[PDB]
Paper text:
The Ser/Thr protein kinase PINK1 phosphorylates the well‐folded, globular protein ubiquitin (Ub) at a relatively protected site, Ser65. We previously showed that Ser65 phosphorylation results in a conformational change in which Ub adopts a dynamic equilibrium between the known, common Ub conformation and a distinct, second conformation wherein the last β‐strand is retracted to extend the Ser65 loop and shorten the C‐terminal tail. We show using chemical exchange saturation transfer (CEST) nuclear magnetic resonance experiments that a similar, C‐terminally retracted (Ub‐CR) conformation also exists at low population in wild‐type Ub.
To overcome this and to generate exclusively Ser65‐phosphorylated Ub in the Ub‐CR conformation, Leu67 was mutated to Asn, and Thr66 was mutated to Val (termed hereafter Ub TVLN mutant). Ub TVLN was phosphorylated only once, on Ser65, showed a clean, single‐species bTROSY spectrum highly similar to Ub L67S in the unphosphorylated form, and when phosphorylated was highly similar to the phosphoUb‐CR conformation (Wauer et al, 2015a). Together, this showed that Ub TVLN is an excellent mimic for the Ub‐CR conformer. Hydrogen bonding patterns observed in the crystal structures matched the experimentally determined hydrogen bonding pattern for the phosphoUb‐CR conformation (Wauer et al, 2015a), and the phosphoUb TVLN structure is similar to a recently reported NMR structure of phosphoUb‐CR. Likewise, in phosphoUb TVLN, the Ser65‐containing loop is extended and seemingly mobile, with the phosphate group exposed making no contacts to the Ub core. For Ub TVLN, we observe ~99% occupancy in the Ub‐CR conformation at 45°C, with an exchange rate of 120 s−1. PhPINK1 interaction leads to almost complete protection of the entire Ser65 loop of Ub TVLN showing that in the Ub‐CR conformation the phosphorylation site is part of the interface with PINK1. Hence, phosphorylation of the Ub‐CR mutant Ub TVLN is ~45–140‐fold faster as compared to variants where this conformation is much less populated (wt Ub) or disfavoured (Ub L71Y).
Author numbering: 1 to 76
Write the structure that this text describes.
């Protein structure tokens, strides 16, 4: 399935993912596209912070056809 990520500029990228994919797996894909180390990423879905050992299915990524995660840059 495809998801969007809103990036630090408010633009979107698309990732090809499966519901069982971990948040750590998603953050690695975001690192490859946006150059943010995973330990400096905070990923949000519907205002909820996503935890690295959990999966997209844990956050019900399947409920909607179109989903946008939000990338935030941890503060220094």
């Amino acid at each position: 399935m495809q998801i969007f990520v809103k990036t630090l500029t408010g633009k979107t990228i698309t990732l090809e993912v499966e519901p069982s994919d971990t948040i750590e797996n998603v953050k690695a894909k975001i690192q490859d596209k946006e150059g943010i180390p995973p330990d400096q990423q905070r990923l949000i879905f519907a205002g909820k912070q996503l935890e690295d050992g959990r999966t997209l299915s844990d956050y019900n990524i399947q409920k909607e056809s179109v989903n946008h995660l939000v990338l935030r840059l941890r503060g220094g």
